[PDB]
Paper text:
The ferrous iron and 2-oxoglutarate (2OG)-dependent [name] prolyl hydroxylases (PHDs/EGLNs) catalyse trans-4-prolyl hydroxylations on [name]α subunits, thus promoting their binding to the von Hippel–Lindau protein (VHL), a targeting component of a ubiquitin E3 ligase, and signalling for [name]α degradation under normoxic conditions. Biophysical analyses employing crystallography and NMR reveal that the molecular basis of PHD isoform and variant selectivity involves enzyme–substrate interactions involving β2/β3 loop residues (that bind the LXXLAP motif) and helices α3 and α4, regions which display sequence variations between the PHD isoforms.
Analysis of a [name].N-oxalyl glycine (NOG).CODD complex structure led us to propose that certain erythrocytosis-associated [name] variants (P317R and [name]) would have altered substrate selectivities. Arg371PHD2 (βVI-VII loop) apparently positions the Arg370PHD2 side chain in ODD binding: Arg370PHD2 interacts with both Asp395NODD (electrostatic) and Leu559CODD (hydrophobic); substitution of Arg370PHD2 with alanine did not affect CODD hydroxylation, but gave ∼35% reduction in NODD activity, demonstrating Arg370–Arg371 is more important in NODD than in CODD hydroxylation.
Author numbering: 188 to 404, 408 to 411
Write the structure that this text describes.
């Protein structure tokens, strides 16, 4: 499906109505599996961190660590299909220009690849950008073949602002997710009991990012 059609007929109206949008079968099986192979190779070759320190025990060998990350630019050897994913995300956002709220996206982060190792850790409730740092859209791509949350957990639970309900999103293979990064969307990752991979990119709003430079100072003489 052409990126522009997906953007105009789905992403734009969904984001303006719900602020949370799911695209299944984004890249297709072949490409999705190649991305999975690249992420697994990063893991198997030691490129991820050891994981977020969750619980400190008196014996440090018993410390519990959770999500593991690595930052990816997309041109690294062994990462070019991740790069292709990022370019595909960028093309979608570009086709949405000037239609996602009143935001004007002019840049993004590198990709944050995350691995929940399957040891019952998740991620606490949080907002991605609560303090005006420039990030307006979160884009996540999931890689987990035959993920079944009733068995393996790892649901992303989002709590759209001022709603008596939440939205549970399974981290399914070849699924792409968009949501507003600010306080519209507090969210959490429920405990994961199998290896769970995702790739996140954040897109910046031009105005917010420009004035974030002021708030968070950059020196000339
Ligand atoms: O993986 C998901 O479905 C949702 N994950 C997150 O919301 C998430 N958010 C943040 Cl800000 C971080 C931040 C650092 C490491 C992992 C994160 C993460 O998985
Ligand atoms: Mn988050």
């Amino acid at each position: 499906l052409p990126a522009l059609k997906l953007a105009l007929e789905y992403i734009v109206p969904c984001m303006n109505k719900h602020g949370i949008c799911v695209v299944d079968d984004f890249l297709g099986k072949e490409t999705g599996q190649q991305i999975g192979d690249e992420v697994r190779a990063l893991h198997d070759t030691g490129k991820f961190t050891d994981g977020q320190l969750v619980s400190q025990k008196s014996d440090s060998s018993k410390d519990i660590r959770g999500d593991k990350i690595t930052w990816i630019e997309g041109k690294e050897p062994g990462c070019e299909t991740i790069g292709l994913l990022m370019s595909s995300m960028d093309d979608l956002i570009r086709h949405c220009n000037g239609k996602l709220g009143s935001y004007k996206i002019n840049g993004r982060t590198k990709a944050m690849v995350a691995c929940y190792p399957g040891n019952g850790t998740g991620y606490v409730r949080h907002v991605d950008n609560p303090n005006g740092d420039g990030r307006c859209v979160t884009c996540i791509y999931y890689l987990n073949k035959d993920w079944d949350a009733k068995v393996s957990g790892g649901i992303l639970r989002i709590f759209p602002e001022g709603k008596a309900q939440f939205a549970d999103i399974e981290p399914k293979f070849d699924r792409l997710l968009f949501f507003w990064s600010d306080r519209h969307n507090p969210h959490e990752v429920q405990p994961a009991y199998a290896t769970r991979y995702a790739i996140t990119v954040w897109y910046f709003d031009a105005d917010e990012r420009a004035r974030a430079k002021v708030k968070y100072l950059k020196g000339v003489r």
